[PDB]
């Protein structure tokens, strides 16, 4: 449970699961009872049973012409490693500063702030996507 | 001599178990062996009370201790059985010839 590094704590617990899974596969492929029994006992013996709290921890909820801004944002979305449909704010910032740099001088700061806003939008969007695929793996 | 046979049988088994213990120790008694051991534990799980009961009933019986026409039918039965035994040996010899 990482308040500040939630995405990590997620991907960690995820691959930790995947490990435990390949493990239990092998172990049942040959034999053991004790460790299985103890994990079970701690998982169900009457305190919210453990796997129940673990479930409970994955949280299930989640100057510019607007439509063209939406198109540009959509072109800067990459499927992050987990299938997170993230808006890459670095590329969006680069392209937005590029559209600014290419009556024009007096509105330069306005377009610059607009670009920074589009970038922050892409950033929060990528963050949402991350968290999405994170809860997905979870 | 038979009582000696059984007691020495226990002795043989016990020295054998001590030989399967003393050396074979060492974090090796594993998958197939552990499987056999678990099966054996389960066996020891799978009577002794009914046996105590039977020993008791026998104790009771022990302390409690402390027909012309029928012989003809018995003779009929024994004669019939003696008749059948020979045909049985006949089947045996015929099969052996078949071998």
Instruction: Tell me the DSSP string of B17-81.
Output: HHHHHHTT-SS---HHHHHHHHHHHHHHH--HHHHHHHHHHHHHHHHHH--HHHHHHHHHHHHHH
Pull the structure tokens for residue A95: 């392209």
Q: Pick from A8, A131, A137, A1: which is nearest to A57 by CA?
A: A1
**Distances from the Cα of B82 to the Cαs of A24, A76, B25, B87, in angstroms?**
66, 103, 60, 9
SS3 B10: helix
Give the position of tokens 């449909």. Answer: A85
User: Is residue A77 classed as helix, strand or coil in its secondary structure?
Assistant: strand
3-state secondary structure B63-96: HHHCCHHHHHHHHHHHHHHHHHHHHHHHHHHHHH
Burial A17-44 (b: 16+ CB within 10 A, else e): eeeeeeeeeeeeeeeeeeeeeeeeeeee
Is-contact A112 A100, C-beta < 8 A? Answer: yes
Interface list for chain A against chain B, based on CB atoms closer than 8 Å: 30-31
Dihedral angle at the C-alpha atoms of B54, B56, B61, B62, nearest 10 degrees? 110
Rounded Cα distance between A70 and A66, Å, is: 6
Nearest chain B residue to A27, by CA: B31
CA distance to partner chain A, nearest, from residue B16 (Å): 27
Minimal Cα distance from A32: which residue of B? B31
State whether A30 and B31 contact (CB < 8 Å): yes
Half-sphere exposure of residue B5: CA atoms within 13 angstroms, side-chain side: 2
CB atoms within 10 A of CB A92: 25
Q: At what angle do helices A34-44 and A6-30 cross, to 10 degrees?
A: 140
Q: How far is A27 from chain B (nearest CA, A)?
A: 11
Please list, residue by residue across B67-79, b when 16 or more beta carbons sit within 10 angstroms of its beta carbon and e when fewer do: eeeeeeeeeeeee
Is A85 exposed, middle or buried (CB count within 10 Å of its CB: 0-12, 13-18, 19+)? middle
Are A62 and A132 in contact by the 8 Å Cβ rule? The answer is yes
C-alpha–C-alpha distance, residues A85 and A74, integer Å? 10
Query: With contact defined as beta carbons under 8 Å apart, do A11 and A82 qualify?
Result: yes
Please say whether the beta carbons of A77 and A86 come within 8 A. yes
Q: What are the Cα distances from residue A15, in Å, to A23, A24, A81, A83?
A: 12, 14, 13, 15
Q: Which residues contact A86 (CB under 8 A, 6 or more apart)?
A: A77, A78, A79, A80, A125, A126, A127, A129, A130
φ and ψ at B3, to 5 degrees?
A: -60, -40
Q: How many CB atoms lie within 10 A of CB A137?
A: 17
- Kindly provide the resolution of this structure in angstroms, with one decimal: 4.2
* C-alpha distance from residue A53 to each of A20, A38, A59, A74, B27 (Å): 18, 17, 11, 37, 37
């Amino acid at each position: 449970s990482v308040e500040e590094s939630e995405i990590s704590a997620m991907n960690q617990m995820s691959w930790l699961m995947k490990t435990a899974t390949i493990e239990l596969r092998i172990t049942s492929l040959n034999r053991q009872r004790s460790h299985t029994q103890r994990l079970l006992h701690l998982l169900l013996d009457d305190v919210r049973r453990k796997i129940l709290r673990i479930l409970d921890s994955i949280q299930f909820s989640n100057f510019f012409d607007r439509s063209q801004i939406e198109q540009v944002i959509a072109n800067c979305e990459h499927k992050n490693r987990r299938g997170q449909t993230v808006c890459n704010v670095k590329l969006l910032h680069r392209v937005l500063v590029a559209e600014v740099n290419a009556a024009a001088i007096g509105q330069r700061p306005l377009l610059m702030e607009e670009i920074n806003t589009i970038l922050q939008y892409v950033v929060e969007r990528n963050k949402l996507l991350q968290c999405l695929h994170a809860k997905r793996h979870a | 001599y038979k009582r000696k046979l059984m007691e020495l049988s226990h002795r043989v088994l016990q020295v054998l178990i001590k030989q399967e213990i003393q050396r074979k120790s060492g974090f090796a008694i594993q998958a197939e062996e552990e499987q056999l051991r678990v099966q054996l534990d389960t066996i020891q799980s799978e009577f002794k009370g009914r046996l105590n009961e039977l020993m008791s009933q026998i104790r009771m019986q022990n302390h409690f201790g402390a027909l012309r026409e029928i012989k003809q039918h018995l003779k009929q039965q024994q004669e019939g059985v003696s008749h059948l035994i020979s045909i049985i040996k006949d089947n045996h010899e015929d099969i052996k010839l078949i071998e």
